[PDB]
Amino acid sequence: SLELGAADIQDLESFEAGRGALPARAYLQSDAPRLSLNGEWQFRLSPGSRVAPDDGWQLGEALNGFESLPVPSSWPMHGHGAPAYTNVQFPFAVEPPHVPEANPIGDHLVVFEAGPEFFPHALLRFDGIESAGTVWLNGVELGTTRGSRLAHEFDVSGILEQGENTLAVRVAQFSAASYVEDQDMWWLPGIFRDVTLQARPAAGIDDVFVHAGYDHITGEGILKVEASRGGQAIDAVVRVPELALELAAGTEVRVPAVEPWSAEVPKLYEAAVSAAGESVALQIGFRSIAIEDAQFKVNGRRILLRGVNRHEHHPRLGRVVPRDVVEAELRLMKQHNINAIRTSHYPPHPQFLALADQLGFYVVLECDLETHGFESAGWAQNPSDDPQWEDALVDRMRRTVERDKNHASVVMWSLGNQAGTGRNLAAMSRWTKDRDPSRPIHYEGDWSSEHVDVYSRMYASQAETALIGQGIEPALNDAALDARRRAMPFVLCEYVHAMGNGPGGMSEYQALFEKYPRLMGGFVWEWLEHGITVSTADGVDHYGYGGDFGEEVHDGNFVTDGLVDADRRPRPGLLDFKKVIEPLRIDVARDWTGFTLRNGQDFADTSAFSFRYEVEADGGALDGGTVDVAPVAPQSETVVELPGSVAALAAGLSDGRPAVLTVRAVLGADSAWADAGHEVAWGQSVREPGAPVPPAPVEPVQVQDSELTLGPVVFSRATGMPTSIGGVPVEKLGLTLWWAPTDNDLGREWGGADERPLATQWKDAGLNRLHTRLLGISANPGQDGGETLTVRTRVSAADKQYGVLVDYTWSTDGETVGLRTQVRRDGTWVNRGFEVEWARIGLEFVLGEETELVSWFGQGPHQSYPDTGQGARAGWFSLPLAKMDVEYVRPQECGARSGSRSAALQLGGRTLEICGDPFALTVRPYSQDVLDAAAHRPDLKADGRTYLYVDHALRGVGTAACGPGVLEQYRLKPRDADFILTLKVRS
Amino acid sequence: SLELGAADIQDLESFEAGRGALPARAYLQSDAPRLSLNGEWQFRLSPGSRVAPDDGWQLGEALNGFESLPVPSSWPMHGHGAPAYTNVQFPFAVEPPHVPEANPIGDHLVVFEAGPEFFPHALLRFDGIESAGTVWLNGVELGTTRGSRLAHEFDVSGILEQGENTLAVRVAQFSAASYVEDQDMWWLPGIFRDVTLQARPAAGIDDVFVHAGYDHITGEGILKVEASRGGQAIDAVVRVPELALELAAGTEVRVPAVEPWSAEVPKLYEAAVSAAGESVALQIGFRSIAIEDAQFKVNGRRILLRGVNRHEHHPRLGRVVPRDVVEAELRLMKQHNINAIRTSHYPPHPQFLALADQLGFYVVLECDLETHGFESAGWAQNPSDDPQWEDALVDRMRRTVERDKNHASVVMWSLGNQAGTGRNLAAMSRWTKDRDPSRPIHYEGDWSSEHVDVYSRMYASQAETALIGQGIEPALNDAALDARRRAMPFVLCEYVHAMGNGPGGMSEYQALFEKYPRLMGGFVWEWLEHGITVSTADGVDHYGYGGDFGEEVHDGNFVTDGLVDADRRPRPGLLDFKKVIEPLRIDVARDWTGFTLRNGQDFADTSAFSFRYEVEADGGALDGGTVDVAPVAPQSETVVELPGSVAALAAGLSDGRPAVLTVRAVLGADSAWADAGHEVAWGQSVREPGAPVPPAPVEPVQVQDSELTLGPVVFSRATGMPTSIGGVPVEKLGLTLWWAPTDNDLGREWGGADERPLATQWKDAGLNRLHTRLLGISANPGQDGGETLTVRTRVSAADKQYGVLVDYTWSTDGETVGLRTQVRRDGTWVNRGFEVEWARIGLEFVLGEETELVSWFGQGPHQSYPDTGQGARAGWFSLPLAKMDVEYVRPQECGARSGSRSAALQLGGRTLEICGDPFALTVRPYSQDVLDAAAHRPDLKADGRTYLYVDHALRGVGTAACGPGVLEQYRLKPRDADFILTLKVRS
Ligand SMILES: OC[C@H]1O[C@@](CO)(O[C@H]2O[C@H](CO)[C@@H](O)[C@H](O)[C@H]2O)[C@@H](O)[C@@H]1O
Ligand SMILES: OC[C@H]1O[C@@](CO)(O[C@H]2O[C@H](CO)[C@@H](O)[C@H](O)[C@H]2O)[C@@H](O)[C@@H]1O
Ligand SMILES: OC[C@H]1O[C@@](CO)(O[C@H]2O[C@H](CO)[C@@H](O)[C@H](O)[C@H]2O)[C@@H](O)[C@@H]1O
Ligand code: NA
Ligand code: NA
Ligand code: NA
Ligand code: NA
Ligand code: NA
Known part of the structure; x- marks a missing residue:
């Protein structure tokens, strides 16, 4: 038998838990002396057990190949090998308990001083080693560790020397334990949690077990604190000053009144359990689970x-x-x-x-x-x-x-x-x-x-x-x-x-x-x-x-x-x-006279909150204040009247003027986790703006050799597309049906006989490569010598027979432009035997200038899609272009603002305004193909244009990467559609 | 109606054949004057009909935007746009007869001189325009062309002017005709065949229809040559000098004896059909089809x-x-x-x-x-x-x-x-x-x-x-x-x-x-x-x-x-x-006394061939010559005796000495298509070399700290792999089961419920990412104090439970090394519910030096796989490393030499020799992962190593890219296997 390293490998392949460790116990705050060994250690990496040196390095003298490394650490985060990510897949052959030959072996060494307070008895504590550690102290083997996120302690009595000591830990990345640590996360070997030297004074306390129940009928606490040493119950005194308690460890008592612990109200009582030689500090929360x-x-x-x-x-x-x-x-x-x-x-x-x-x-x-x-x-x-x-x-x-x-x-x-x-x-x-x-x-x-x-x-x-x-x-x-x-x-x-x-x-x-x-x-x-x-x-x-x-x-x-x-x-x-999990429900009355308030908490009333209202309009805030709410019990509700000024403001509103009433529940005082004024829950009532009225078509079409003009819009006679709107250069206008696939769209939907991811269904259907044929351009009688302009097109993709006829009808009074878009299926949208779903029904405007600022009335400030956006509230928003985006690690469709009624893009000196019945708004400095092709954010590049998306319909985003896809109500199946927008440019 | 270019597009969308052309007729060699207009034309490209200028360019004066272009041409081959390849897919939306907006429009113009011999009557001939042409002469529209690979002719009488003329052709890449020209090939617009001016003298001949049948009972020819002008039969004289024939056009005659035309014997008789004003030259082959x-x-x-x-x-x-x-x-x-x-x-x-x-x-x-x-x-x-x-x-x-x-x-x-x-x-x-x-x-x-x-x-x-x-x-x-x-x-x-x-x-x-x-x-x-x-x-x-x-x-x-x-x-x-379609079958007798000869031709006997034999051995040719074969009739066979020297040489051969008898049928004289000595058919009989005898294991294993030595081979004790063989550095040795997918392996096999391409089945199974675990290394008693060395390993892939146990047993007498490899399945090779097939059962040697020369006894010179290699004959071959490769455009598995009995690699000063029962041999200067990753040949890079593949088994390559996959007899399903090789190094 001639192979090297068989003993090391035999240990790594062991089914046993670690060897040599003290009994498992609680992590306890003690007054016993302790010394953290965290800090700069020395580290050497070998590629496998068979070549990891047996060169006496545990003695710490004449170390060849060691360099400094912080401990605790995940050592591939510091240039030693590399992180590796698998979800389910094991990264080694599935032959348990066997380990692969490529198995990073990390030798760790630190020299430290131990004062007299660590004698006669001390231990060494390791709160985590991934995945297999062997520990030596002054060349003496203490034992091994298994369970990478679990604590191990080793008795060093009679091995620790007063003064200088040398701690050595050999860590194998992979072991038999890897077979039972296949979490979906990075594989990261290392001594990645604390290393501690703890004195173990005589007449001390090794373990404590707090039992602190709550009798919700009587309000009593039921308390018993067990304490042991060497696995045996010991005499100790438990003191709980705030409850006026002094009792023996090991005896159950009934505390006459305690305030119970919950996540909502995390009441904790300070306590200590003391023996002659050691005292443990505890925080006791009384609560019972049933x-x-x-x-x-x-x-x-x-x-x-x-x-x-x-x-x-x-x-x-x-x-x-x-x-x-x-x-x-x-x-x-x-x-x-x-x-x-x-x-x-x-x-x-x-x-x-x-x-x-x-x-x-x-x-x-x-x-x-x-x-x-x-x-x-x-x-x-x-x-x-x-x-x-x-x-x-x-x-x-x-x-x-x-x-x-x-x-x-x-x-x-x-x-x-x-x-x-x-x-x-x-x-x-x-x-x-x-x-x-x-x-x-x-x-x-x-x-x-x-x-x-x-x-x-x-x-x-x-x-x-x-x-x-x-x-x-x-x-x-x-x-x-x-x-x-x-x-x-x-x-x-x-x-x-x-x-x-x-x-x-x-x-x-x-x-x-x-x-x-x-x-x-x-x-x-x-x-x-x-x-x-x-x-x-x-x-x-x-x-x-x-x-x-x-x-x-x-x-x-x-x-x-x-x-x-x-x-x-x-x-x-x-x-x-x-927003989805907000613990209060605030339903604001349509007539702005008040709001219904439900306390959804399980234990707390509403006394921690201040209830605020604000009315906002185009010019900003019109009214605001606070209102007194008698505390609402958990799981109860009430109706709260708002001050009369608020409803009066609603009554006086001229028709079609948008205004938003928001009622908010905020922290009335600082908590442990946020400052006063932190918002917990909210509700709104919106007075919607009237539909934008399309302008009178009183301008006629001016015909030139290669261009047409209709008020402020210039068209190409070769394409029928606008080439400028009020001076803003338009490079392209067309229908959209697709978006750059999200992570969810790249997941399979197991629901039917089509298990292609949506992204693949789209690619197979050509939805990412639409082309448009021009069918004709004609002017029509408008009003008072005015004309409308209808551009007839058909959108399809190479090698497909299905299409949509898209007609654009343009009108203007000279300042406002009316654009009516009509979409009609021509042929069945079926490909490879399955019906093609759409991501959207919308328009892409490619503008020949950059956008600095995007403002809108609708939902915000962040993105919203049909089955998301709960946290986007009604209001007026304005953001620099960069802040419209979402920095997902793999770039993908994002940044749409659903529910928009009006939008304004600032392209240098001009402002382009869009109004319509609800539409989703997206604005980007790069194309959808750049977005789809990018695997990381640095792959995104601005090209000097503005890509403006106005969507009459969007599909939902679902959770198909793992779990349910888009629910039925948010799917977007091919359909005929028509929608109106108005446009105008301001200088 | 305001869109541009509607008339041009309406023409392109027409269902009609071209307009204005003369009646379709034969391509005829005539004595009528003709002038090729091929040469340098002027060319302008527009991106679609709606923007193609209407600027009088057909008159040829003041041309803006034109540059020179050879005609005939495929214009994307000359920097104008780009070639585009689709197989089945149309590259435009499937809305016939409609054409896309992106439609390259090529305007072509040439100025030429027409002498008096082209008057009064001439035509212009176009032998191909892809896909739609409109033709003007001196500004006068002649007509249009449809059918991209078909000829069109236009009468120019009264439009052609004596002296200078201007020819203008507008060519659209796409038209309605594209819907009926969806061949699997490059889309290439252009005037891609001849343009010709032909005089049409009075009393000429427009069309001719040769009827030349063969009566195989009597040996007669049945001849009628029709001739017409303006679609009417005319008086003309047909002369066929070699057959002593002078007859009227339009009358059927019986020629008493003709020699019939076939592909084997393409007898043609020169003929002419003449009217007063024009004579047509013909080549007549008499043949009837039934x-x-x-x-x-x-x-x-x-x-x-x-x-x-x-x-x-x-x-x-x-x-x-x-x-x-x-x-x-x-x-x-x-x-x-x-x-x-x-x-x-x-x-x-x-x-x-x-x-x-x-x-x-x-x-x-x-x-x-x-x-x-x-x-x-x-x-x-x-x-x-x-x-x-x-x-x-x-x-x-x-x-x-x-x-x-x-x-x-x-x-x-x-x-x-x-x-x-x-x-x-x-x-x-x-x-x-x-x-x-x-x-x-x-x-x-x-x-x-x-x-x-x-x-x-x-x-x-x-x-x-x-x-x-x-x-x-x-x-x-x-x-x-x-x-x-x-x-x-x-x-x-x-x-x-x-x-x-x-x-x-x-x-x-x-x-x-x-x-x-x-x-x-x-x-x-x-x-x-x-x-x-x-x-x-x-x-x-x-x-x-x-x-x-x-x-x-x-x-x-x-x-x-x-x-x-x-x-x-x-x-x-x-x-x-x-070789598969060779028209003669030559079956050489095992005892080398002669060969059976079948003439597989349909008409010709064997008189065109010289029959040659050669005997070759390790030292080269030992005997050779020609033999007289009485002509064998088509579909007949005979047995041909070889000279006695050949069989005598076979009788005297010492056992185990390889020798190859090849009988070849070559052209005895120059033909129209090759020179005398050109090889048409061949057959062989091989006296095989005896199995190589494994050397006596009389050397023991020498053990050092980190290495083992066994005669000329050094091993790593950490890996069990050899690190040098007779001084040749070995960087890696391991089992192979996979190869870089061929084009066929990337195709689906529709035969079963698994329609994944083989390449995908392999990737899903991890076959391209094998890893090896070392189980042990031990020495065993050989002979006279000698020892064998057995290295036990297991090969699998990450996240899989199936593997193969691979045991290498090494032996040496000090000059020759014996290597026995034993493979045993451990667990069922099933993945995603389907059994995993293997590409091979073999070894990869990665050598730390470059190979200059590869020699072998086996089949050659070119590659051979189990279901190919018919043209690889038995012999001794030697090639520089580069010539072992195959320059497929997308690099892929290739270059294996199946049926090898011995091989010699020259790595600088040393020669590494391998012997065994039949094995396939491949040698490359780059790895399989480099080969698989490469999409084009420049992606291949040498890394200074030699990758040597010795395969005991290979699968077939099939035709799964389109048609049948690997036939059952050539599939390689997981199995247990064992095989012996011998190795030795020479300086
Ligand atoms: O396949 C369902 C079935 O598998 C079990 C184990 O037999 O659970 C495993 O598979 C589930 C489905 O993937 C996982 O959700 C679960 O975590 C895993 O243990 C059964 O409990 C279950 O019925
Ligand atoms: O780090 C937690 C810490 O955040 C603080 C201060 O930032 O809380 C405030 O800051 C948040 C930043 O968004 C606010 O959103 C939050 O509403 C506000 O209280 C600390 O108070 C808190 O302890
Ligand atoms: O180009 C065809 C032409 O090839 C010739 C000369 O090269 O034929 C000879 O050359 C071939 C090259 O491989 C030989 O393979 C062939 O056997 C030989 O006759 C011309 O003769 C032939 O017409
Ligand atoms: Na995850
Ligand atoms: Na519930
Ligand atoms: Na109050
Ligand atoms: Na092809
Ligand atoms: Na046949």
């Missing part, structure tokens, strides 16, 4: 989960998320009305839990387990059902539960994610129910729900959710399991996939959540895009995604699928989501 | 068509094919045993016909008609069935037939190609049968064969051809039409699609052609690749194809699908085809 009548209840009430799935990602540091970024993003979530977080799909940094307790989120704390890439072989060799993996998988769940069991914010334990069904998941569930019966068990991966307490699905359609909400979904084959599941409350652990332009269809889910008590709510997939900052040639910065780092196998931009970008800048989807 | 007993017969005998489809293309001049290129390519065809040409899919240049008469080809003369792009709408609006198109389509057939009706080589008229079924095709057939009953009618497009005389298909499988050959194919629904068709002979007008590496499966068709009299044979698709020469940055030259010229819609490299490249360099497919 499943009753097919509802998930906290403190006696059904709650609504307004959730997101939170991965840990940083665009420059990988899995290392700085604390200030964590604090800021949780405040951002609260500021967008989120009340719940799922830790997809592993425990977070241990510091996250106290922030969730404090700011207030319902947390689904999920174990580090995912075997998704076994699905493609029918789950053959799945670790979840393989007896050899039982100890490893129970260990993951044990470490998960033990670390975070004291936190009020944790309201469910999750076994893992997309790991199939199997006996080891049952073992993990049984262990958890025995250890901590206070929290229900979640696991979507087994739809029978045999070993869980809630029925969880991901991306179930709105239709299926409505059936589940009514308790009428199809039965399981097993009657006993069906009865159990039908009595469970239902949660969407992932829904309304937020990739690219979208997500559409959020309102339809939310209406069901509000209607059906069995529905717990849902967690958007996902909070953040995992973009990785990259540099172009001129040092331009942009986000990269799958395949941008040389991966042989990858899943492209599927890692950029979030409500916020990697730097936590909101995508439009977050602005819409904030 | 369909009898479901056979296509010429001169009383069934013939075998050994055919190609000939387009007219030139890589720098487009549709203009210089005469010297025509002459050379027809000689090249004869030199590759071709005897038949289909003029796909329009009449050729008129000069082609006399060359075919002279050199000898059976010609299928096809009308300019193809409506293929209507198929995708179920043939809705197909012109072939639209009454408005009757006159246009009958006109095309009339001009087709009238031009070429005097040529003996034309043995069938074809109505067109892929034009569906319809009443206008029936009209064309009826017109043709009435006008010229002497030639059968061909048209594949209507499978019922209602209006034809032969049953024609394209790309029918070998299986279906065998059924048709036996007369047992499934019946038509209509019993009367079925009876008619079952009594027709059967031709493949297109088969064994020759795109890229291939075509495979030619032998299986040919065996059927020889077995079944109903089978007429077939015409390969196609003779030439339509590559267009393009230049890179350093002025490197390469061929471009579809999409390389900016086309919005195109069909890529489907235009490069020929037996020869655009410069008429043979592809390997032509070398194989020559």
